[PDB]
UniProtKB/Swiss-Prot annotation:
<dbReference type="GO" id="GO:0046471">
    <property type="term" value="P:phosphatidylglycerol metabolic process"/>
</dbReference>
<dbReference type="GO" id="GO:0048146">
    <property type="term" value="P:positive regulation of fibroblast proliferation"/>
</dbReference>
<dbReference type="GO" id="GO:0009986">
    <property type="term" value="C:cell surface"/>
</dbReference>
<keyword id="KW-1015">Disulfide bond</keyword>
<feature type="binding site">
    <location>
        <position position="30"/>
    </location>
    <ligand>
        <name>Ca(2+)</name>
    </ligand>
</feature>
<dbReference type="GO" id="GO:0005509">
    <property type="term" value="F:calcium ion binding"/>
</dbReference>
<dbReference type="GO" id="GO:0050830">
    <property type="term" value="P:defense response to Gram-positive bacterium"/>
</dbReference>
<keyword id="KW-0964">Secreted</keyword>
<feature type="disulfide bond">
    <location>
        <begin position="27"/>
        <end position="123"/>
    </location>
</feature>
<dbReference type="GO" id="GO:0032052">
    <property type="term" value="F:bile acid binding"/>
</dbReference>
<feature type="disulfide bond">
    <location>
        <begin position="51"/>
        <end position="98"/>
    </location>
</feature>
<feature type="binding site">
    <location>
        <position position="28"/>
    </location>
    <ligand>
        <name>Ca(2+)</name>
    </ligand>
</feature>
<dbReference type="GO" id="GO:0006633">
    <property type="term" value="P:fatty acid biosynthetic process"/>
</dbReference>
<feature type="active site">
    <location>
        <position position="99"/>
    </location>
</feature>
<keyword id="KW-0865">Zymogen</keyword>
<dbReference type="GO" id="GO:0050482">
    <property type="term" value="P:arachidonate secretion"/>
</dbReference>
<dbReference type="GO" id="GO:0016042">
    <property type="term" value="P:lipid catabolic process"/>
</dbReference>
Length: 123
């Protein structure tokens, strides 16, 4: 953790507290996620979820019996641009890329506050 991810979003969105703002949004942002993404931000989340699902099927992780949920990488934040550290092994670089793409996706999409705390039956 979360923790690294939380730190990435803030790097692109310095004004936010991502565990509060990007949590429980739409159908996908937050625990699980199903149905059709309700907006571009939901789709950001749908993708990220997908990128974690894929990471688990990766050999490089499947050792290192890795958990996307616990995957431990390094990244730096400078001037609101994120760089995933070369020192990452393949598995941790895959996860860092997942987190990186989401960070960025989040900063380019509209925020629809009618989609926070949605009834998943709309999903
Ligand atoms: Ca999700």
């Amino acid at each position: 953790x979360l923790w690294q991810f939380n730190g990435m979003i803030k790097c692109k969105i310095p004004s936010s507290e991502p565990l509060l703002d990007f949590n429980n949004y739409g159908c996908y942002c937050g625990l699980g996620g199903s149905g059709t993404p309700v907006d571009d931000l939901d789709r950001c989340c749908q993708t990220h979820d997908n990128c974690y699902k894929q990471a688990k099927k990766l050999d490089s992780c499947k050792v290192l019996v890795d958990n996307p949920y616990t995957n431990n990488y390094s990244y730096s934040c400078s001037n609101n641009e994120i760089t995933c550290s070369s020192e990452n092994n393949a598995c941790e670089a895959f996860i860092c890329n997942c987190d990186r793409n989401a960070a960025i996706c989040f900063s380019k999409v509209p925020y629809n506050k009618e989609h926070k705390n949605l009834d998943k039956k709309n999903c």
